Amino acid sequence: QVQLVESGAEAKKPGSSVKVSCKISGGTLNDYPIRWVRQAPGQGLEWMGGIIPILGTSYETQKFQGRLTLTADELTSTVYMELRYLTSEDAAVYFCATMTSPVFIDALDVWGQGTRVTVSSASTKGPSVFPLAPSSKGTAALGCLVKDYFPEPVTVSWNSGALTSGVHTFPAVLQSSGLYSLSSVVTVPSSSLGTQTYICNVNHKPSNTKVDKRVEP
């Protein structure tokens, strides 16, 4: 079964070069020309280019000529793309894809796992955490506000819990300052407001670090 395995997620500063890999399993590079496609978060797919190793040729769309370079390495059965002169509109998910039959022409049959590329404006930088206050008063919902993301959406668990107890995968949208910020809501019957302590976890930015916050009115 032909499949494509891509490289890990990358975060790069503007104006630099990013190089993404794609290794083919179950098939020869000469038997499977590789197409490079991308999509920005929320937007549709965008055809970038393609490489035909058996002809030793490559092509890119007009929007990517001069910035996109496609190369192949047959002994490691790998294809590399390299994008240069990065811009805020170049942070996206990048896919390498192929097809299993000549009838598809350009209907892409097999796809890579994808690679996330973040055109940054900073480096590893921690968040800020702030609780809520009594708002008005059936049940009651309280939250723990977070700010100033950067090193990719993050997860961290300490003193946390088991299944259910709500879901916490809130959006983490960006700001005009180039720094994301998400919210969170935990809801409970209002009576437990008078006796139960609300210690909420908060995402920390690098990967291995944490913030916890107790909410007391």
Partner: peptide, 8 residues
């Protein structure tokens, strides 16, 4: 365009 072999 993207391949050396296709059915037309």
């Amino acid at each position: 365009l993207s391949t050396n072999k296709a059915v037309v």
